[PDB]
RNA sequence: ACCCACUCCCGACCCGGGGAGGUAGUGACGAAAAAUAACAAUACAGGACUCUUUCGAGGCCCUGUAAUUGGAAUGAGUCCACUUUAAAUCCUUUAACGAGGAUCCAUUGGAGGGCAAGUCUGGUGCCAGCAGCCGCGGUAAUUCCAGCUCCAAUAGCGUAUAUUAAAGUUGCUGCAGUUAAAAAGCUCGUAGUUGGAUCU
């Protein structure tokens, strides 16, 4: 078929610049944060388990 | 506020496109994992 | 032909199932409790324990009076008691199967520095060890995975050259004193 | 049933050796016709010259136009249809270019909607398609 | 590229020679150890503890989160010297300099299921594209193109191909043959395989 529409969508998406974020920790520090967030720091729940990236 | 009901979601979308998701949600409501 | 050696081996095995929730939770609990860098350090100790268990199980299929069993199980039990995972009263060959990975994790230099009060945290203990502040009876050791023998347990201290063990003040103290 | 005599080793071994030929994969690997018919000749990758650009219609129930290239291999001269997988990467390939081609992932079997296509383009003009797509390297020119 | 200093070999030889060999250079084939931060005070939040029945109460303790404060510890680097070696290099040892955005910035693949992790927002509209497989996309896309956030391993992570386990889907252990693929139309018969008790 016609090959003129190649790259149509990727060339239509409006450009958005990434924002500036503080650098993430690496190595042992990242694992310490994960351990403190998943097990050490827990709030009481009523059985409705939510995922880490739940929204609405 | 009570927003989402896993039981209703499964019972309605069990045969729809979003079945594999809602099932995965329902188990989280049941087994606590 | 060359005069080199090519003997080497791996020290860990990856799990068969990449994404298992229970295994991930257990491994992350171990890493958090003992301040390990990554999952590979857990797998290394798991491999060591697996090898020990395999040897013990292979020696338990022989007759009790077999000379090789008597010679080699005695050596294995002696080494286990020497490193401190086993006890003197439990020096039978069956008790080896009752060992767990936490017993081997408790004998690292990183956890022993923290348990002896030299450091106020396990991560602080690892930092102190890696920065050449800890010595083992004469020698400055900076390897966190160092396995402390029983007879060396009493002989962990600060190094004589460390600012903590009576040495010269560090770079920051000297610079700040020069400031004022 | 099977023979369970103590002196039947020859019979058992001969029967197993003869019945291994009814396995599709064993016969494919040990017959030599598949290796002869394979355009790569057993290689993981190959280099070719882009003869032209083509568009292949996706099989039903999907509807699309998959962008592919007809190329000719350098070592044996065979002609091959390769897939250029990304959004808009077909504009990174020019005619008479030299490209590196690898398998599609199913060991000579077609993948997905694309009918009869078992190869994909990896590098064009000695630079990887991923670098061009992510804007890390430019075409040599 | 450097050397016969080591290991050994040859010669009439204690002395000569050796791209054999050794030492450096390239080297993410691959294997081992192991940095990318630690602590304290505040400012919030939880638990235990007590007294107060409840509103409550606290440096009274323990634990978490802050481009909020503070001063301590360091090696990556620059670089005297010694040591190393045939002469060097590297490692080790040591002077001096050397960290707050400690900008001395960790990446590779994913976020429907298999399989850990968002039917959040903006585009596109069976197009572009994704997708190992099932599948998604035809105006409210959990799957495309992006932003944010979240997962997995980590100085490593994807892809293509050969191969092993998974395969009790080549079955000796250990598979099947009524209807899912399957027992020769029937009988005889050589080789092969197998072969009833009994002797102190
Ligand atoms: Mg076929
Ligand atoms: Mg479709
Ligand atoms: Mg010599
Ligand atoms: Mg000489
Ligand atoms: Mg040479
Ligand atoms: Mg040579
Ligand atoms: Mg390695
Ligand atoms: Mg860094
Ligand atoms: Mg990413
Ligand atoms: Mg996305
Ligand atoms: Mg999945
Ligand atoms: Mg899941
Ligand atoms: Mg289909
Ligand atoms: Mg829309
Ligand atoms: Mg949308
Ligand atoms: Mg196999
Ligand atoms: Mg098996
Ligand atoms: Mg098969
Ligand atoms: Mg069996
Ligand atoms: Mg079968
Ligand atoms: Mg049939
Ligand atoms: Mg019949
Ligand atoms: Mg006969
Ligand atoms: Mg008999």
Swiss-Prot record, chain A:
Source organism superkingdom: Eukaryota
Chain positions found as N6-succinyllysine: 48
Disulfide bonding pattern of the chain: none
Biased composition (Basic residues): 20-33
UniProt subcellular location: Cytoplasm; Nucleus
UniProt-annotated stretches for the region Disordered: 7-33
Function: Component of the 40S subunit of the ribosome. Contributes to the assembly and function of 40S ribosomal subunits.
Subunit composition and interactions: Component of the 40S subunit of the ribosome.
Protein name: Small ribosomal subunit protein eS30
UniProt lineage: Eukaryota, Metazoa, Chordata, Craniata, Vertebrata
From Swiss-Prot, chain B:
Top-level taxonomic group: Viruses
Annotated localization: Host cytoplasm
Chain spans, region Binding to 40s ribosome mRNA entry channel: 7-33
Domain spans labelled BetaCoV Nsp1 C-terminal: 1-32
Function: Inhibits host translation by associating with the open head conformation of the 40S subunit. The C-terminus binds to and obstructs ribosomal mRNA entry tunnel. Thereby inhibits antiviral response triggered by innate immunity or interferons. The nsp1-40S ribosome complex further induces an endonucleolytic cleavage near the 5'UTR of host mRNAs, targeting them for degradation. This inhibits the integrated stress response (ISR) in the infected cell by preventing EIF2S1/eIF2-alpha phosphorylation upstream of stress granule formation and depletes host G3BP1.
Protein name: Host translation inhibitor nsp1
Residues of the whole record sequence present: 148 to 180 of 7096
Effect ascribed to mutating residue 18 to A: Complete loss of ribosome binding and cellular translation inhibition
Gene that encodes the chain: rep
Swiss-Prot record, chain C:
Keywords: Acetylation, Cytoplasm, Isopeptide bond, Nucleus, Phosphoprotein, Ribonucleoprotein, Ribosomal protein, RNA-binding, rRNA-binding, Ubl conjugation
Entry's localization field: Cytoplasm; Nucleus, Nucleolus
UniProt-listed CDD domains: S4
SS bond partners: none
GO MF entries: RNA binding; rRNA binding; structural constituent of ribosome; translation regulator activity
Residue span, S4 RNA-binding domain: 107-180
Phosphoserine found at: 152, 162
Pfam families: Ribosomal_S4, S4
N6-acetyllysine modification, residue list: 65, 115, 154
Main location: cytoplasm
GO cellular component terms, semicolon-separated: cytoplasm; cytosol; cytosolic ribosome; cytosolic small ribosomal subunit; extracellular exosome; focal adhesion; membrane; nucleolus
Biological processes, Gene Ontology terms: cytoplasmic translation; positive regulation of cell population proliferation; ribosomal small subunit biogenesis; translation
Glycyl lysine isopeptide (Lys-Gly) (interchain with G-Cter in SUMO2), cross-linked positions: 92, 138
Region (Disordered): 161-180
Annotated effect of mutating residue 136 to F: In a breast cancer sample; somatic mutation
Segments traversing the membrane: none
Family note: Belongs to the universal ribosomal protein uS4 family.
Quaternary assembly: Component of the small ribosomal subunit. Identified in a IGF2BP1-dependent mRNP granule complex containing untranslated mRNAs. Part of the small subunit (SSU) processome, composed of more than 70 proteins and the RNA chaperone small nucleolar RNA (snoRNA) U3.
Stored PANTHER family: 30S 40S RIBOSOMAL PROTEIN, SMALL RIBOSOMAL SUBUNIT PROTEIN US4
Protein name as it appears in the record: Small ribosomal subunit protein uS4
Record organism: Homo sapiens (Human)
Higher taxonomy: Eukaryota, Metazoa, Chordata, Craniata, Vertebrata
From Swiss-Prot, chain D:
Record's function text: Component of the ribosome, a large ribonucleoprotein complex responsible for the synthesis of proteins in the cell. The small ribosomal subunit (SSU) binds messenger RNAs (mRNAs) and translates the encoded message by selecting cognate aminoacyl-transfer RNA (tRNA) molecules. The large subunit (LSU) contains the ribosomal catalytic site termed the peptidyl transferase center (PTC), which catalyzes the formation of peptide bonds, thereby polymerizing the amino acids delivered by tRNAs into a polypeptide chain.
Protein name as catalogued: Small ribosomal subunit protein uS12
Primary gene name: RPS23
Keywords annotated in UniProt: Acetylation, Cytoplasm, Deafness, Disease variant, Dwarfism, Endoplasmic reticulum, Hydroxylation, Isopeptide bond, Nucleus, Ribonucleoprotein, Ribosomal protein, Ubl conjugation
UniProt keyword DNA repair, yes or no: no
One example GO MF annotation: RNA binding
PANTHER family (alphabetical): 30S RIBOSOMAL PROTEIN S12 FAMILY MEMBER
CDD domains per the UniProt record, alphabetical: Ribosomal_S23
Organism: Homo sapiens
Location of the protein in the cell: Cytoplasm, Cytosol; Cytoplasm; Rough endoplasmic reticulum; Nucleus, Nucleolus
């Amino acid at each position: 078929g016609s090959l003129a529409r190649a790259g149509k969508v990727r060339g239509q998406t409006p450009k958005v610049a990434k924002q500036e974020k503080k650098k993430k920790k690496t190595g042992r520090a990242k694992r310490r944060m994960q351990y403190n967030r998943r097990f050490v720091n827990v709030v009481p729940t009523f059985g409705k388990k939510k995922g880490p990236n739940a929204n609405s | 506020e009570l927003g989402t009901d896993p039981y209703e979601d499964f019972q309605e979308n069990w045969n729809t496109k979003h079945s594999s998701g809602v099932t995965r949600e329902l188990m989280r409501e049941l087994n606590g994992g | 032909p060359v005069a080199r050696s090519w003997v080497c081996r791996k020290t860990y095995v990856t799990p068969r199932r990449p994404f298992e929730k229970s295994r991930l939770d257990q491994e992350l609990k171990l890493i958090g409790e003992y301040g390990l860098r990554n999952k590979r350090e857990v797998w290394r100790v798991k491999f060591t324990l697996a090898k020990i268990r395999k040897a013990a199980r292979e020696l338990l299929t022989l007759d009790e009076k077999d000379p090789r069993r008597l010679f080699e199980g005695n050596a294995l039990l002696r080494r286990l008691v020497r490193i401190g995972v086993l006890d003197e009263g439990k020096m039978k060959l069956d008790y080896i199967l009752g060992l767990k990975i936490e017993d081997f994790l408790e004998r690292r230099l990183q956890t022993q520095v923290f348990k002896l009060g030299l450091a106020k945290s396990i991560h602080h203990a690892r930092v102190l060890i890696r920065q050449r502040h800890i010595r083992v009876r004469k020698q400055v050791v900076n390897i966190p995975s160092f396995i402390v023998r029983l007879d060396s347990q009493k002989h962990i201290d600060f190094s004589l050259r460390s600012p903590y063990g009576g040495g010269r003040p560090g770079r920051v103290k000297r610079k700040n004193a020069k400031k004022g | 049933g099977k023979c369970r005599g103590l002196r039947t080793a020859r019979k058992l071994r001969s029967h197993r050796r003869d019945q291994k030929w009814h396995d599709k994969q064993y016969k494919k690997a040990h017959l030599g016709t598949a290796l002869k018919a394979n355009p790569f000749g057993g290689a993981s990758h190959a280099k070719g010259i882009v003869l032209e650009k083509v568009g292949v219609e996706a099989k039903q129930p999907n509807s699309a136009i998959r962008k592919c290239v007809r190329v000719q291999l350098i070592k044996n001269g065979k002609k091959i249809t390769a897939f250029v997988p990304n959004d808009g990467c077909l504009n990174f390939i020019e005619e008479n270019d030299e490209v590196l081609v690898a398998g599609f992932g199913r060991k000579g079997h077609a993948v997905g909607d694309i009918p009869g296509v078992r190869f994909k383009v990896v590098k064009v003009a000695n630079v990887s398609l991923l670098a061009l797509y992510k804007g890390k390297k430019e075409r040599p020119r």
